[PDB]
Amino acid sequence: YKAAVEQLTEEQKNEFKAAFDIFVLGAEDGSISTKELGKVMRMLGQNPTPEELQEMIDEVDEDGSGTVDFDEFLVMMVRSMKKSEEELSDLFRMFDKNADGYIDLEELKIMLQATTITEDDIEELMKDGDKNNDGRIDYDEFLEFMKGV
Ligand SMILES: CC(C)COC[C@H](CN(Cc1ccccc1)c1ccccc1)N1CCCC1
Ligand SMILES: CC(C)COC[C@H](CN(Cc1ccccc1)c1ccccc1)N1CCCC1
Ligand SMILES: CC(C)COC[C@H](CN(Cc1ccccc1)c1ccccc1)N1CCCC1
Ligand SMILES: [Ca+2]
Ligand SMILES: [Ca+2]
Ligand SMILES: [Ca+2]
Numbered sequence: 001y002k003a004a005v006e007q008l009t010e011e012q013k014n015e016f017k018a019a020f021d022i023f024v025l026g027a028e029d030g031s032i033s034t035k036e037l038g039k040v041m042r043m044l045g046q047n048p049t050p051e052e053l054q055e056m057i058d059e060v061d062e063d064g065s066g067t068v069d070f071d072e073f074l075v076m077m078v079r080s081m082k083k084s085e086e087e088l089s090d091l092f093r094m095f096d097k098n099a100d101g102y103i104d105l106e107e108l109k110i111m112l113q114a115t116t117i118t119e120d121d122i123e124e125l126m127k128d129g130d131k132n133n134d135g136r137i138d139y140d141e142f143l144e145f146m147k148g149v
Helices: 010-023 034-043 050-060 070-081 084-095 105-112 119-129 139-147
Strands: 102-104 136-138
Touching: 010 034, 010 070, 034 050, 050 070, 070 084, 084 105, 084 139, 102 105, 105 119, 119 139, 136 139
Parallel strands: none
Antiparallel strands: 102 136
16 A cells, blocks of 8 residues: 555665666656567566556556656565565566576576666675575475565
């Protein structure tokens, strides 16, 4: 909910902002349309249909603008943290190409293709998610990372 968004620390909002920035790369009016959602999806190795992408945009577009702005992105995230389990597993697998149950530094570099976010940002992301210091994020770490401890 809108209010719950204000429970996020200032650092969480910034991190979500960094993620939002990747989606709006080269976007009109800096908001996420089906076009940008399709580009990230494709960069992650998927091949969504127009119906699937439109379904995702409508699910989080609260003002019927047809696009997702940062405020709506935040609410969307707050909502998933506080079905979500399944999307999380798929997302993990999108990064875990060899299916060994880990996301290593190289696999995270997928986010630099056709791209705002930098290698330093990636190595930092890795440190944030890698709790046991083995240079990788396993599924349990990933879930804790995505849900918030
Ligand atoms: C590498 C694969 C294991 C991940 O793809 C799984 C897809 C993702 N979904 C939704 C989704 C998108 C983003 C993040 C998590 C889930 C999907 C839907 C439309 C287009 C591409 C993927 N789900 C489709 C139904 C069950 C599998
Ligand atoms: C997967 C979770 C961490 C966040 O859940 C949001 C995703 C799609 N997101 C994020 C996303 C999209 C593609 C690839 C990775 C993550 C989303 C993003 C932008 C616009 C709309 C939805 N689904 C929410 C319900 C249906 C959509
Ligand atoms: C799931 C999406 C809404 C984006 O989530 C963004 C980041 C890291 N993502 C990076 C990412 C960028 C763009 C699209 C999808 C994901 C991430 C990626 C891989 C492994 C761990 C985190 N999470 C860190 C803690 C909560 C936010
Ligand atoms: Ca909107
Ligand atoms: Ca892997
Ligand atoms: Ca680890």
